[PDB]
Design an enzyme around this catalytic site. Sequence first.
Site, PDB file in Angstrom:
ATOM      1  N   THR A  77      37.489 -23.918  41.046  1.00  0.00           N
ATOM      2  CA  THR A  77      36.929 -24.292  39.744  1.00  0.00           C
ATOM      3  C   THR A  77      35.976 -25.464  39.837  1.00  0.00           C
ATOM      4  O   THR A  77      36.015 -26.252  40.792  1.00  0.00           O
ATOM      5  CB  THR A  77      38.014 -24.654  38.738  1.00  0.00           C
ATOM      6  N   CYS A  78      35.137 -25.583  38.810  1.00  0.00           N
ATOM      7  CA  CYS A  78      34.055 -26.555  38.776  1.00  0.00           C
ATOM      8  C   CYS A  78      33.908 -27.214  37.401  1.00  0.00           C
ATOM      9  O   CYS A  78      33.537 -28.391  37.285  1.00  0.00           O
ATOM     10  CB  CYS A  78      32.750 -25.864  39.179  1.00  0.00           C
TER      11      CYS A  78
END
Length: 183
Positions: free
Chosen positions: A174-175
């Site tokens: 995830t970012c």
Amino acid sequence: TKYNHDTKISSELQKKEYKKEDLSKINSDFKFWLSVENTNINYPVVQSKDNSYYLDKDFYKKDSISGTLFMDYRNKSIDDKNIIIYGHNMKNKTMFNNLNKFKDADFFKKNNKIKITLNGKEFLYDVFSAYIVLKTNFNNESDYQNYINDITSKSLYKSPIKVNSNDKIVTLSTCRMVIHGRL
């Protein structure tokens, strides 16, 4: 339950995928389809010349806070040793939100496979490490095997799946939630 522009587009692309249309023709950055067992992660994966473009751009290259799932620009072939894909932790439980489900020990214990679908071929990777906190290139087997050891022991839970340098690895990040599969 929130129906907005992003959730609509992505459910339409899922349908074009099921109708086996060629998504390359909608976006030449398309690389493959990605889905994860027992989640709603079931999206298109694209690739830009960087690791930023598709943070804020939908599959049609319009603005979107959902972005598009994208693959690390350094990745070359399905035979890369760590295929890295990035996507968001959206609040309406879309994109890579369901990576969190891998926080659940019992869920993790189950075998949820990561499925890349490319050119009418299905590649299954068995999840073997999940955790909260990134190399695509390894100069040789030593570095690789150290990377495997590194991310194996970062896992919240020991996996009955064992892994070494003769396996290929996919990484969903995830970012900040992260999980690794093995083929």
